[PDB]
Amino acid sequence: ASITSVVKTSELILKSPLLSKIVVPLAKTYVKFSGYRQLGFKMNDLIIEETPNMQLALRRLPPTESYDRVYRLIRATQFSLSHKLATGNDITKPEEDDHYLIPYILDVEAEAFEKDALDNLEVV
Amino acid sequence: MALRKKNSLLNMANSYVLDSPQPSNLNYFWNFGSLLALCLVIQLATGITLAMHYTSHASLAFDSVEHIMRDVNFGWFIRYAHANTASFFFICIYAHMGRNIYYGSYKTPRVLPWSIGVIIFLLLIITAFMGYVLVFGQMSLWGATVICNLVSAIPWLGEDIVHFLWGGFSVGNPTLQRFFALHYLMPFVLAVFALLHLIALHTAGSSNPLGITSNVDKLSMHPYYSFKDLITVFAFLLMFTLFVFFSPDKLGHPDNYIPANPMVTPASIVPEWYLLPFYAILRAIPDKLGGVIAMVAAILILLILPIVDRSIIRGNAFKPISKLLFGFFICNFLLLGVLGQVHIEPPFIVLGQICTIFYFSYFLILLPMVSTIENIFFYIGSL
Amino acid sequence: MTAAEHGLHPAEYPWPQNGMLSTFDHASLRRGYQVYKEVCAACHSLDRIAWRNLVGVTHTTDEAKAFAEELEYDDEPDDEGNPRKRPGKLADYIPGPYPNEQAARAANQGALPPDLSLIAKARHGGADYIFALLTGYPDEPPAGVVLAPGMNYNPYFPGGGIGMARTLFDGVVEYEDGTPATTSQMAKDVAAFLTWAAEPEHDERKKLGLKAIIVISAMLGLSVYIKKFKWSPIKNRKFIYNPP
Amino acid sequence: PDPAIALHEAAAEGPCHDFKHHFDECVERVTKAQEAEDYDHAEYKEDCVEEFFHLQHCINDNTADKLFRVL
Amino acid sequence: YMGWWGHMGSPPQKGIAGYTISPFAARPFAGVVHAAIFNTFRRTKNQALFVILPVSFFYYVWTQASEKNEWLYTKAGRHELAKAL
Amino acid sequence: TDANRLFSYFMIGSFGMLSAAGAKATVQDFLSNMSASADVLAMAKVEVKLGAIPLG
Amino acid sequence: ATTFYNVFVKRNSAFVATILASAFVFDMTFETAIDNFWDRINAGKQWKDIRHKY
Numbered sequence A: 001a002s003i004t005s006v007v008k009t010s011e012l013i014l015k016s017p018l019l020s021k022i023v024v025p026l027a028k029t030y031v032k033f034s035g036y037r038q039l040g041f042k043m044n045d046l047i048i049e050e051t052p053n054m055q056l057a058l059r060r061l062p063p064t065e066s067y068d069r070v071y072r073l074i075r076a077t078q079f080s081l082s083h084k085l086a087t088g089n090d091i092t093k094p095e096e097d098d099h100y101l102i103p104y105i106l107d108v109e110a111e112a113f114e115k116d117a118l119d120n121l122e123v124v
Numbered sequence B: 001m002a003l004r005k006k007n008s009l010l011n012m013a014n015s016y017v018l019d020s021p022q023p024s025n026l027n028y029f030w031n032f033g034s035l036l037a038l039c040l041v042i043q044l045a046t047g048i049t050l051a052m053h054y055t056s057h058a059s060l061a062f063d064s065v066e067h068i069m070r071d072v073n074f075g076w077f078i079r080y081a082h083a084n085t086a087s088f089f090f091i092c093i094y095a096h097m098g099r100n101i102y103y104g105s106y107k108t109p110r111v112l113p114w115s116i117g118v119i120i121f122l123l124l125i126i127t128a129f130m131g132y133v134l135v136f137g138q139m140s141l142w143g144a145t146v147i148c149n150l151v152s153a154i155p156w157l158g159e160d161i162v163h164f165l166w167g168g169f170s171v172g173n174p175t176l177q178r179f180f181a182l183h184y185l186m187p188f189v190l191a192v193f194a195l196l197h198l199i200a201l202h203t204a205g206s207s208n209p210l211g212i213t214s215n216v217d218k219l220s221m222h223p224y225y226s227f228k229d230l231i232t233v234f235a236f237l238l239m240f241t242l243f244v245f246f247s248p249d250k251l252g253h254p255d256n257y258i259p260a261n262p263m264v265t266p267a268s269i270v271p272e273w274y275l276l277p278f279y280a281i282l283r284a285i286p287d288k289l290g291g292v293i294a295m296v297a298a299i300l301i302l303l304i305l306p307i308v309d310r311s312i313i314r315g316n317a318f319k320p321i322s323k324l325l326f327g328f329f330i331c332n333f334l335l336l337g338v339l340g341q342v343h344i345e346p347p348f349i350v351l352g353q354i355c356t357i358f359y360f361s362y363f364l365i366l367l368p369m370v371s372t373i374e375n376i377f378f379y380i381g382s383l
Numbered sequence C: 001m002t003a004a005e006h007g008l009h010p011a012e013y014p015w016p017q018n019g020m021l022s023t024f025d026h027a028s029l030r031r032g033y034q035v036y037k038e039v040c041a042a043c044h045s046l047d048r049i050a051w052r053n054l055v056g057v058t059h060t061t062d063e064a065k066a067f068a069e070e071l072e073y074d075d076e077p078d079d080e081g082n083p084r085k086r087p088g089k090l091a092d093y094i095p096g097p098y099p100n101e102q103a104a105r106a107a108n109q110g111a112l113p114p115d116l117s118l119i120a121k122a123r124h125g126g127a128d129y130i131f132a133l134l135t136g137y138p139d140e141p142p143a144g145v146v147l148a149p150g151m152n153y154n155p156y157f158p159g160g161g162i163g164m165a166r167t168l169f170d171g172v173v174e175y176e177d178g179t180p181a182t183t184s185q186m187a188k189d190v191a192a193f194l195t196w197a198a199e200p201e202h203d204e205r206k207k208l209g210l211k212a213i214i215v216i217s218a219m220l221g222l223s224v225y226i227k228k229f230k231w232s233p234i235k236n237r238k239f240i241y242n243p244p
Numbered sequence D: 001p002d003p004a005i006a007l008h009e010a011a012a013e014g015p016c017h018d019f020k021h022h023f024d025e026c027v028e029r030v031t032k033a034q035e036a037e038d039y040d041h042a043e044y045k046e047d048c049v050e051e052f053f054h055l056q057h058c059i060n061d062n063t064a065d066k067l068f069r070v071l
Numbered sequence E: 001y002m003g004w005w006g007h008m009g010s011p012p013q014k015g016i017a018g019y020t021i022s023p024f025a026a027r028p029f030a031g032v033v034h035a036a037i038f039n040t041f042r043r044t045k046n047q048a049l050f051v052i053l054p055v056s057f058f059y060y061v062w063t064q065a066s067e068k069n070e071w072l073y074t075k076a077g078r079h080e081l082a083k084a085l
Numbered sequence F: 001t002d003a004n005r006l007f008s009y010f011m012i013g014s015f016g017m018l019s020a021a022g023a024k025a026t027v028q029d030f031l032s033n034m035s036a037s038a039d040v041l042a043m044a045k046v047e048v049k050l051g052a053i054p055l056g
Numbered sequence G: 001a002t003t004f005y006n007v008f009v010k011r012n013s014a015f016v017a018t019i020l021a022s023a024f025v026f027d028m029t030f031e032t033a034i035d036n037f038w039d040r041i042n043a044g045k046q047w048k049d050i051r052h053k054y
Ligand code: HEC
Pocket: C035, C036, C039, C040, C042, C043, C044, C108, C111, C112, C113, C114, C119, C123, C130, C133, C134, C157, C161, C162, C163, C164, C165, C167, C168, C190
């Protein structure tokens, strides 16, 4: 699934009051049980990157964001191999779990999807 | 420049076993690949040795296996090693496939090593099936009979193909001699495909338990994974030892110590344990051709995992719902295994059908739904 | 399936050879051979065992040669190409009671007594099944069982009706070692002997297994030390990050 | 004599007495049912195999070790 | 998607200092007892439900099915078996 | 210290030693399958008459 | 310890020679040890134990 898909569907849910009332609390619990924050990751660090689109989005990250992501990946790899969890400031607090990458990938995909559409245009 | 890099031949070995850059966080489930290579080497050594003492002619086959047991120096060991390692080969291959499914090893960019992997699995099944026939005991003969008759389901030409495979009108000497020749060949074919799936993997490298890139943090294959592989090699050899020396017949069927008799049918004709889930799936469909299709589809459906998994994240480490679904899928696969060896009786008939539906609905319904929902939960949950 | 169709499952008897470190009792093996020779051999062959196989297990070279030399085997034809017999040698296989299946079945009301060389491996239960079967003929079949003609009731046998009658009765054999030959004793001895016949490598296999277990365990322990030693620089790695 | 004769008898009267009774009752019923006419043209003929198995399984559990101890 | 040593395909790394000590300078089994007890307990506790729930469910299913099957092939189960077939 | 290194080489050496002894046992037992099997060794004796054989 | 290291461990040629010589000794002694132990735990049961009667 494309990030675009996930973002659009999420926006449909967040619009509907009923839907958000039942989905948002579930999503927050899901995230708590997921436990990626306990390895000091941000959600966006987990997104599959071995794709042309994602490689382009990562190249467009600001250098600071890019350097910090490299560190979080290396740090999490060290926790993984040691069978430890993050403690203290290494734990990602909910307020630090920012979607730093989502804007970049949404722009990359916007162009890619428009290109596919326009490759199929029919002069009327 | 170091010789290991300069010389083209040495460099190929170097690229796979020494300088090969690995993730630094592979867990013990990444050790089944080398255990599978170990099983393959043991099977080649013991298999070629048994071939020096075995006679493929139906008048002598069963007796040649007894001669191996009784007269050949350490023949008992070589025979039991070969027979038990066939079981261990399947334990390791199921573990390896289990690892791959849990950690999303089938996702891009590793679709090709996974798809070649599915073929390796089919080749192992055929290899092991043909090897079992070679003993020419009661289970050998009757197993061959019923499995080869599944080909009769192919429309129009089905029966003709069966007689072609047998080289006669029933399983007999021609079938045994051809199964010997093909059993000898198939492990070499299998080794080639095993090499192909590694070469295909080398473009992306190994995945890792976190499902993120390891390009940031690599370790040489040697010495780290060399020495880590030794632990599981010795754990494997301990398990091997307990079966081969202390309980060599635990995984076998007593009926295979009775010489093949085309007249007498054994009480229950069951495949070897590792084929039992596929046999349960076949029984579930009442139609002959239906059953065969289902049974083959149960393996070929693995090829669609890259498509039906809709997750933006690789693997299950961080996906609580996917982990629960995976648990149910694996346990259902074991229940299918058990149901493959019960009698066709109430209430196991309907149970087998329910378990078969669950097996397929994992690929076709549940994984696509669950992976879609988890995508949304990750996004909303972290806003 | 009904329990009758399966057969009653035999008790787990404490055989001397049960036990990772236990061999067969060779005195029982010798006594079991004597039961085979005097009772079973009337109807059952032991075709996979040669006289040489007894030597240094149950008998000395001389005793086994004496057994072989009492029999006549087919020799190579003489100079006019006529058939000849010779006395047996240690290389010869123990000869069976019948020339073919048809003769065997004719002598046993249609039933074919199996060869006993692999019977301990060819039946679920092994020695326990052999012992249970031989000692488990009730005096009277359970009320309601209809036996087919030529059949005997035995609950251990699947279906209950076996073509072999009870054959072990107190004192059918006189053991050469003075052991009281009760039904139970003879069944135990012959079951042991037949288990040996099915798996004669048993004793050597378990001793080599002991050696393997010890070596492999030590290697496993050392491999854990060596892995931990080599991996410690990776496990112990620490980072300081100063964001650029 | 066969040590098993006495051990089996002891186990039947002792720890396996409930099973012994059931087998006995069953045999009584079946013999009586066979005694009655037009038994041969009945649909269901009861046996006592089940009860026999329960008794034998019980006797074997209480005897196996004791028997092999005296051989 | 993977290069080789020197050009692995990592985004540029800067600002991380890594430190470690020699295998000969380290105690390989330092803190082994604490790990073996407390670390294993934590890791196991956190995964327990994902094993227990499916195993227990499928064991219950099997137990019920096998007990019914056994009962159907007794004398008592004659009638229910006749209907089932 | 030399004592410190020597200990770890003792572990490595022991491991090499058991691997050497285990490989030797494995190779010897396994290859022995190719030596004459028990039945081959059983063939050993032949009696011949001499009365029939003419001079020269 | 220095002495031991310098003689048996420092040169790999010496280390491998020492390992192989140790393997030879281990192989011979372990054989003998297991033989005796096996004979004690299986006493009176083996052919060698009853052979004298015949
Ligand atoms: C005079 C006949 C006769 C004697 C004596 C005899 N048997 Fe048998 N035995 C048979 C026949 C006939 C069968 C086949 C029964 C059947 O298949 O219904 C048989 C079957 C068996 C079976 C296999 C039952 C099965 O599971 O298929 C074993 C084991 C056996 N005998 C062992 C022995 C032993 C041990 C002895 C004596 C110490 C013995 N027999 C003495 C005639 C004999």
